[PDB]
Curated annotation (Swiss-Prot):
Site description Increases nucleophilicity of active site Ser, residues in chain: K45
Alphabetical UniProt keywords: Antibiotic resistance, Cell inner membrane, Cell membrane, Hydrolase, Membrane, Periplasm, Secreted, Signal
Gene (name only): blaC
Transcription regulation is among the record's keywords: no
Result for mutant: I75F: Significant increase in ampicillin resistance. 2-fold and 3-fold increase in catalytic efficiency with ampicillin and nitrocefin as substrate, respectively, mainly due to an increase in substrate affinity
Induction: Constitutively expressed.
Protein name: Beta-lactamase
Enzyme class: hydrolase
Site description Functions as a gatekeeper residue that regulates substrate accessibility to the enzyme active site, residues in chain: I75
Oligomeric and partner information: Monomer.
Catalysed conversion reaction: a beta-lactam + H2O = a substituted beta-amino acid
Binding-site residues, substrate: S100, T209, G210, T211
InterPro entries, alphabetized: Beta-lactam/transpept-like, Beta-lactam_cat, Beta-lactam_class-A, Beta-lactam_class-A_AS
Length: 265
């Protein structure tokens, strides 16, 4: 039984694991702690981009955003190289997904507008999708504290899987905006050891990672089987019993994805 395999991963990795894969015409849903809250970490950056795409015409992607070194908060592998040139909204979207660029995310939040540096606008975007669960409360920062049991900055595997379903595979976005999201996630650089690692090479995988303290490791993906069937796969984990310093475990995500792959295959 698949639930036992997930429980064994929890015991072997000393982790809490959440998994949701929405049901299809041809497959049952996979759910393991799918309605328990986990920290977003950087997984929010994919729907963030969807929000920016949604609220603006595509010509908005060429708006140059200028910023300063004082805006560098969090790992920002792209943004840190363009403090004096700035970056277009398109480039920020690219960096935010493909390099989980934190500064980029923060600038995209600002681009959405409104209170909380954009976290309100982001959360309302999700509310407008039908998600009454997920919440973004803080801008990215390396100084952020987010202890277990605080419901701020959380989603559920079930919630974020259905959001991603709508965005990539549903009609949340018009096809041209949808394609930009899909493409960016298809060329993610950070996800090779997670869901991607658990799916055979002939499956297409697009994804957005998240990592944090308390051993938090997330990956949200859309996968395409060799037979052309797409599935959304949300995996979230933390190791809170290990405290702030618990090591994130990518392998747990890879192995959970392997259990999923096994059943959709």
């Amino acid at each position: 039984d698949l639930a036992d395999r997930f429980a064994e991963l929890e015991r072997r990795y000393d982790a809490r694991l959440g998994v949701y894969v929405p049901a299809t015409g041809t497959t049952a849903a996979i759910e393991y702690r799918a309605d328990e809250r986990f920290a977003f970490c950087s997984t929010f950056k994919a729907p963030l981009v969807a929000a920016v795409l949604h609220q603006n015409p595509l010509t908005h992607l060429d708006k140059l955003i200028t910023y300063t070194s004082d805006d560098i908060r969090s790992i920002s592998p792209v943004a840190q190289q363009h403090v004096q040139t700035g970056m277009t909204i398109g480039q920020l979207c690219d960096a935010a997904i493909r390099y989980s660029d934190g500064t980029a995310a923060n600038l995209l939040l600002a681009d959405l507008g409104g209170p909380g540096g954009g976290t309100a606008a982001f959360t309302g975007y999700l509310r407008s999708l039908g998600d009454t669960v997920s919440r973004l409360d803080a801008e990215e920062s390396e100084l952020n504290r987010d202890p277990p049991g605080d419901e701020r900055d959380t989603t559920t595997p079930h919630a974020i899987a259905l959001v991603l379903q709508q965005l990539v595979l549903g009609n949340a976005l018009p096809p041209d905006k949808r394609a930009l999201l899909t493409d960016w996630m298809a060329r993610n650089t950070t996800g090779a050891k997670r869901i991607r690692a658990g799916f055979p090479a002939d499956w297409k995988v697009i994804d957005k990672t998240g990592t944090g303290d308390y051993g938090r490791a997330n990956d949200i993906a859309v996968v395409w089987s060799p037979t052309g069937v797409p599935y959304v796969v949300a995996v979230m984990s933390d190791r809170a019993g290990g405290g702030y310093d618990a090591e994130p475990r990518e392998a747990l995500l890879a192995e959970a994805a392997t259990c999923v792959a096994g059943v959709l295959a």
